[PDB]
Write a protein that binds this ligand. Structure first.
Ligand SMILES: [Cl-]
Ligand SMILES: [Mn+2]
Ligand SMILES: [Mn+2]
Length: 161
């Protein structure tokens, strides 16, 4: 998939979010069973790269380009978009909490991490994606193809800096 199909790109990012959330959901039990071993440290490094760097770019794609274009063609999505934007703030705060547990693990491999931070993070994304993905489908249905090609070019540029 390419930025030429921007909605397929948004879904591809969601596949990454789901994979990493699945790992966060496993973390507490894996650590209890095995310790905070090098597999844990590697895994948490990769999760943190995604949520510190890539996820905010995905949120920007939605806020700056996709949601506004969706609303030109599907204004009935307004309340849902507004709630998803409120939720992005919650997603950032949940991620900050997980990030702080990751730093504690890195500093002290005997640390027992706060499982509630992990569960809250996973659940926040579950709730968010269930609301959001329907709007991706609305966008496929209602947004002209050439308008999607146009936001695709902007999204591609965001990754360069
Ligand atoms: Cl998202
Ligand atoms: Mn999304
Ligand atoms: Mn979102």
């Amino acid at each position: 998939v390419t930025f030429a199909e921007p909605i397929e790109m948004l879904y591809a990012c969601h596949g990454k979010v789901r994979r990493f959330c699945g790992q966060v959901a496993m973390l507490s039990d894996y650590i209890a069973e095995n310790g905070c071993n090098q597999i844990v440290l590697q895994t948490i490094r990769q999760i943190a790269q995604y949520f510190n760097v890539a996820a905010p770019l995905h949120h920007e794609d939605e806020e700056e380009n996709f949601f506004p274009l969706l609303l030109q063609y599907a204004p009935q999505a307004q309340e849902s978009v507004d709630e998803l934007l409120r939720q992005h703030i919650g997603l950032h705060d949940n991620w900050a909490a997980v990030s702080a547990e990751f730093a504690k693990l890195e500093a002290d491999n005997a640390y027992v991490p706060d499982e509630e931070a992990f569960k809250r993070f996973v659940a926040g994304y579950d709730v968010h994606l269930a609301i959001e993905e329907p709007l991706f489908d609305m966008g496929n249905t209602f947004i002209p193809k050439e308008k999607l090609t146009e936001i695709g070019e902007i999204m591609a540029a965001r990754r360069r800096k």
